[PDB]
Design a protein around this ligand. Sequence first.
Ligand SMILES: *[C@@H]1O[C@H](CO)[C@@H](O[C@@H]2O[C@H](CO)[C@@H](O)[C@H](O)[C@H]2NC(C)=O)[C@H](O)[C@H]1NC(C)=O
Ligand SMILES: *[C@@H]1O[C@H](CO)[C@@H](O[C@@H]2O[C@H](CO)[C@@H](O)[C@H](O)[C@H]2NC(C)=O)[C@H](O)[C@H]1NC(C)=O
Ligand SMILES: *[C@@H]1O[C@H](CO)[C@@H](O[C@@H]2O[C@H](CO)[C@@H](O)[C@H](O)[C@H]2NC(C)=O)[C@H](O)[C@H]1NC(C)=O
Ligand SMILES: *[C@@H]1O[C@H](CO)[C@@H](O[C@@H]2O[C@H](CO)[C@@H](O)[C@H](O)[C@H]2NC(C)=O)[C@H](O)[C@H]1NC(C)=O
Ligand SMILES: *[C@@H]1O[C@H](CO)[C@@H](O[C@@H]2O[C@H](CO)[C@@H](O)[C@H](O)[C@H]2NC(C)=O)[C@H](O)[C@H]1NC(C)=O
Ligand SMILES: *[C@@H]1O[C@H](CO)[C@@H](O[C@@H]2O[C@H](CO)[C@@H](O)[C@H](O)[C@H]2NC(C)=O)[C@H](O)[C@H]1NC(C)=O
Ligand SMILES: *[C@@H]1O[C@H](CO)[C@@H](O)[C@H](O)[C@H]1NC(C)=O
Ligand SMILES: *[C@@H]1O[C@H](CO)[C@@H](O)[C@H](O)[C@H]1NC(C)=O
Ligand SMILES: *[C@@H]1O[C@H](CO)[C@@H](O)[C@H](O)[C@H]1NC(C)=O
Ligand SMILES: *[C@@H]1O[C@H](CO)[C@@H](O)[C@H](O)[C@H]1NC(C)=O
Ligand SMILES: *[C@@H]1O[C@H](CO)[C@@H](O)[C@H](O)[C@H]1NC(C)=O
Ligand SMILES: *[C@@H]1O[C@H](CO)[C@@H](O)[C@H](O)[C@H]1NC(C)=O
Ligand SMILES: *[C@@H]1O[C@H](CO)[C@@H](O)[C@H](O)[C@H]1NC(C)=O
Ligand SMILES: *[C@@H]1O[C@H](CO)[C@@H](O)[C@H](O)[C@H]1NC(C)=O
Ligand SMILES: *[C@@H]1O[C@H](CO)[C@@H](O)[C@H](O)[C@H]1NC(C)=O
Lengths: 262, 144, 49, 307, 48, 115
Amino acid sequence: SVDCTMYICGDSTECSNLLLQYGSFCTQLKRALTGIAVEQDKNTQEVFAQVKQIYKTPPIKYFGGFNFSQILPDPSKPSKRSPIEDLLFNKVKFKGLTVLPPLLTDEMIAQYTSALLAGTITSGWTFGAGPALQIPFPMQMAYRFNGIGVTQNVLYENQKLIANQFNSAIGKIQDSLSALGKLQDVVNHNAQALNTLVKQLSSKFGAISSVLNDIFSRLDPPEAEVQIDRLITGRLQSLQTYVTQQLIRAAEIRASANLAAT
Amino acid sequence: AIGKIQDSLSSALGKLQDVVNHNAQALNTLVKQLSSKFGAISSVLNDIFSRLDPPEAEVQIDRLITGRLQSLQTYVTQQLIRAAEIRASANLAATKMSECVLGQSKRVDFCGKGYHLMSFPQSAPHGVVFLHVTYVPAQEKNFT
Amino acid sequence: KMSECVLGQSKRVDFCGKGYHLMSFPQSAPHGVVFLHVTYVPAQEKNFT
Amino acid sequence: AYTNSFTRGVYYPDKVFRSSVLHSTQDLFLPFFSNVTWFHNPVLPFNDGVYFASIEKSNIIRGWIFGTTLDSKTQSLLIVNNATNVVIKVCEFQFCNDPFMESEFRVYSSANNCTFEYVSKNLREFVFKNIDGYFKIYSKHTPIDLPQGFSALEPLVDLPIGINITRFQTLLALHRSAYYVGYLQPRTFLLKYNENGTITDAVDCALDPLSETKCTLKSFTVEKGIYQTSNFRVQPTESIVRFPNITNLCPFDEVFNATRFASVYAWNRKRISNCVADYSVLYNLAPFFTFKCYGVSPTKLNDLCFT
Amino acid sequence: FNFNGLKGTGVLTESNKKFLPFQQFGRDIADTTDAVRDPQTLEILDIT
Amino acid sequence: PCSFGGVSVITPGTNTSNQVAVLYQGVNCTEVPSNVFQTRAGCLIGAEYVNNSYECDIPIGAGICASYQTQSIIAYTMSLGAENSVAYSNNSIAIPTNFTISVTTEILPVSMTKT
Ligand SMILES: *[C@@H]1O[C@H](CO)[C@@H](O[C@@H]2O[C@H](CO)[C@@H](O)[C@H](O)[C@H]2NC(C)=O)[C@H](O)[C@H]1NC(C)=O
Ligand SMILES: *[C@@H]1O[C@H](CO)[C@@H](O[C@@H]2O[C@H](CO)[C@@H](O)[C@H](O)[C@H]2NC(C)=O)[C@H](O)[C@H]1NC(C)=O
Ligand SMILES: *[C@@H]1O[C@H](CO)[C@@H](O[C@@H]2O[C@H](CO)[C@@H](O)[C@H](O)[C@H]2NC(C)=O)[C@H](O)[C@H]1NC(C)=O
Ligand SMILES: *[C@@H]1O[C@H](CO)[C@@H](O[C@@H]2O[C@H](CO)[C@@H](O)[C@H](O)[C@H]2NC(C)=O)[C@H](O)[C@H]1NC(C)=O
Ligand SMILES: *[C@@H]1O[C@H](CO)[C@@H](O[C@@H]2O[C@H](CO)[C@@H](O)[C@H](O)[C@H]2NC(C)=O)[C@H](O)[C@H]1NC(C)=O
Ligand SMILES: *[C@@H]1O[C@H](CO)[C@@H](O[C@@H]2O[C@H](CO)[C@@H](O)[C@H](O)[C@H]2NC(C)=O)[C@H](O)[C@H]1NC(C)=O
Ligand SMILES: *[C@@H]1O[C@H](CO)[C@@H](O)[C@H](O)[C@H]1NC(C)=O
Ligand SMILES: *[C@@H]1O[C@H](CO)[C@@H](O)[C@H](O)[C@H]1NC(C)=O
Ligand SMILES: *[C@@H]1O[C@H](CO)[C@@H](O)[C@H](O)[C@H]1NC(C)=O
Ligand SMILES: *[C@@H]1O[C@H](CO)[C@@H](O)[C@H](O)[C@H]1NC(C)=O
Ligand SMILES: *[C@@H]1O[C@H](CO)[C@@H](O)[C@H](O)[C@H]1NC(C)=O
Ligand SMILES: *[C@@H]1O[C@H](CO)[C@@H](O)[C@H](O)[C@H]1NC(C)=O
Ligand SMILES: *[C@@H]1O[C@H](CO)[C@@H](O)[C@H](O)[C@H]1NC(C)=O
Ligand SMILES: *[C@@H]1O[C@H](CO)[C@@H](O)[C@H](O)[C@H]1NC(C)=O
Ligand SMILES: *[C@@H]1O[C@H](CO)[C@@H](O)[C@H](O)[C@H]1NC(C)=O
């Protein structure tokens, strides 16, 4: 969120009466940025908040062999993240600019993910269409092979082999991590727009100076109104560029959130 | 179950109301820019061409042209940005029309919540309403 | 479409051409791709009880 | 005594008809829920306009007097109304210190240089203001501590006098055989017009939070949610100007008052350092000095510094 | 047309608005003049 | 810098009440100049913070919402949902014996106005 008056004018009060003479440009900026701010929380709810109840796994945590400890939460942590989630988060104020916090904390998101994991491992896909119906996991895997055209005895006669091979295959995932460039790019693109927006305040745009107080200190009002009006136009153009790009870039992350929710 | 739809709608069309209202607010915002100076002596051409000689009035007219042109060019850019979104929504509505009404889909949470049986379209002022009929299991018991 | 129409058989209605999808073949174009969709269409219905 | 106004001192800001349009205006009003003095008399200040209400079926209040000194040697206003009709007059007067058969008008004893003439329970409201030399009066007479309600006041007269006002007094009918004074401040309201063109409601946009939300949304009904309405800015106190030391006056004397200047081809350059110049010593000596500054004036840089 | 200072262009027609007995002309939403009163005959006319 | 930030007003709607709470965004509650509550999103004044957990009504941020329930105005931490414990075992199954037909709607915009 950008404070239009503090970005353009900046502290000065003689400027505020001049900025009012350009109409509702500062109202448009606030409305446009609020639209983005509301959609970004809805994007997250649609991807993760697809479960009614918060499911938990049973204490034993032994599902016919298959070992899921690398994707289930670690009870010996303040954050209750999984071992793989701990790796995933280890790789990625100014002149009127502020950053608002998300509505959902990352603890709350972790609770949606653990509910999806606990629902699936114990009831497969039945809880997404109604009540959760328990079935042993080994039998869940056998139905899944049937869905791809493999006869179900292939699992039941080879249950140990598939469970042991799976456990190593999932174990290799950490080695490939210890990738997330698509997540760092989102951070970089916004950091670059905020670093550029601030740097554009040190530009004269063809005026005598770039500071709205220094103009007055060494110039009469009749001519100072012209010099300040040039700087206002230049910095107002900066805000229009910034907000237009945030709308175009927010449509791209929204399309990605729709794919992730799907 | 069909008889209850009427209560749920009468007590709901927010997605259609917001797109109509948002566009009207942008068009009214465009008109409100015709009463700003944009760094000029006035906003009325009958005052710029009446208290200035031609070499002095040209400067004030350019200030109004620049301000009003900038506002109109902003208006049209924002419509291109919104136009891509309604088109994307229409492509989703066209996809559901084929896959939910002219067929039975297995895609999860694409044609309602439950197991898709059938869907019926209804027209709306600037969009389409789908009535999704799904199968939902109930009253489970445990067995061995 | 390349994965779901050419590298497999789709059941999505109208997604891979009009009719019951059998197969697709890609062709290149100067700045795009052209799909040839092969579909099965029934004909000549009769009445029964 | 003092009393509490509720929603009083709202007047039609101008002509211009209008229908259902929550219009936003900035002007001089009486703030809502304000502290209005009560009188049962002494000269009061003016400062910027006046609200004046009163209650009484009979007519005890017999006009007002306005001006800067309320005395001779300068112009003043005099507004009276006998049982006939209102008679405004603008002259230089000499007012009794206590101004007040059935014979009356012992108010003044001089009427020189007149620049304007004119001839022609119960709640009688008035708003007096003086802007760009115009002395406007709003009023309304509605039959029945002030009560509680809303009613917009209509303009009656507009007088292009030009006169300045800084103080005023009142005139009362004595016994021989109660009024209010508010003041106006620059505020912002959101005014609701009906289809008949009258103001039916208002919101004071500088009163409480809620009202700021209504004004920003341009409505009188706010839906549940959270709205950004304004901003918080801490303010600085005191002005601390630091420096190490040193002191002296810049030797401009020896430059301007030199007995001989250089030839232009061999122009002379005096470098200045470590002194305090009062550039206001210059500018003076008007008969043939010419000053022509490029990049700044001579008033603004006297509060500036250079290496 | 020009009505004692109000300069504009348009078609004048009989109105059905009712001004207050001190108002000369009316404006619409977005603040554009849409009705005036004739100084001589005191009748409200719309401007389209 | 000498602390600045947005000020937002939390309202239940004028058709419910005229009570309001005010959030000073990223302002410390010691530098503002009853009910003063410090949140990671700023300083909240005029709402009471409770230890219960409800469904989110008016979202403030960082897991905190406000509601008109306890009346008065309160703040709290949202509830994601109930808590279900599936009776899982290595030889138990649940099978439905009945079902219901359900009907839902979905609304999608297709067009806009041509200007
Ligand atoms: C699930 O896999 C984890 C490893 O990913 C197992 O935990 C490790 O077990 C080995 C011995 O087999 C120990 O040397 C490691 O110290 C263990 N790691 C940790 C973090 O404790 C775990 O035992 C497996 N679970 C089951 C039921 O086999
Ligand atoms: C099946 O039988 C029906 C009648 O039960 C046929 O309907 C005919 O439809 C044509 C128009 O296509 C009408 O002009 C005729 O009047 C109808 N006939 C009767 C008896 O009602 C239908 O054509 C038959 N279908 C096929 C494939 O032969
Ligand atoms: C500015 O003036 C003050 C006052 O003369 C200077 O203060 C002196 O500083 C020296 C060094 O610390 C001391 O030994 C003296 O006793 C100080 N004088 C007094 C009266 O306190 C100060 O140094 C000057 N600043 C500069 C930059 O020259
Ligand atoms: C302005 O003057 C005209 C005459 O020039 C007035 O017109 C008269 O209007 C009344 C009705 O109001 C008629 O009964 C008269 O017959 C009109 N006179 C003529 C000569 O036509 C008009 O009323 C005047 N306007 C005002 C506001 O006084
Ligand atoms: C399936 O049987 C289990 C028991 O084997 C039932 O789960 C128990 O239900 C009681 C309440 O009736 C709880 O107090 C226990 O804590 C439950 N046990 C566990 C492990 O969660 C369950 O209700 C039965 N399901 C159905 C659909 O009847
Ligand atoms: C399956 O559930 C339905 C209800 O969803 C049962 O039908 C109800 O039966 C009761 C008792 O006879 C009636 O009072 C209701 O009117 C019925 N509802 C409807 C919608 O018809 C049905 O009996 C159940 N089936 C079985 C085998 O138990
Ligand atoms: C009005 O202000 C005076 C001080 O100027 C104070 O004594 C009085 O109590 C105030 N009135 C009200 C109603 O607050
Ligand atoms: C009313 O007062 C005015 C004051 O100037 C005076 O001229 C006029 O004669 C008075 N009328 C009567 C009937 O006394
Ligand atoms: C005002 O009256 C005085 C005499 O009282 C006179 O000297 C002066 O010229 C008058 N002013 C004007 C503007 O007539
Ligand atoms: C009113 O007084 C101010 C000073 O307070 C002065 O500058 C101004 O010229 C005066 N106005 C008139 C009309 O005399
Ligand atoms: C004044 O407004 C009321 C309420 O809308 C309406 O009924 C009435 O007709 C109006 N009066 C006139 C003279 O238009
Ligand atoms: C020097 O300048 C000062 C100030 O302008 C003036 O008082 C003085 O007369 C000047 N000296 C001479 C010799 O002109
Ligand atoms: C809004 O007010 C109407 C009465 O004007 C009432 O019927 C309705 O229940 C109110 N809505 C809420 C949410 O209180
Ligand atoms: C506010 O300041 C106090 C110290 O005065 C500090 O203890 C507290 O943590 C600060 N609050 C925030 C939110 O930074
Ligand atoms: C909420 O519970 C904590 C302990 O978890 C306690 O310290 C705190 O006082 C409680 N808050 C209220 C408002 O009772």
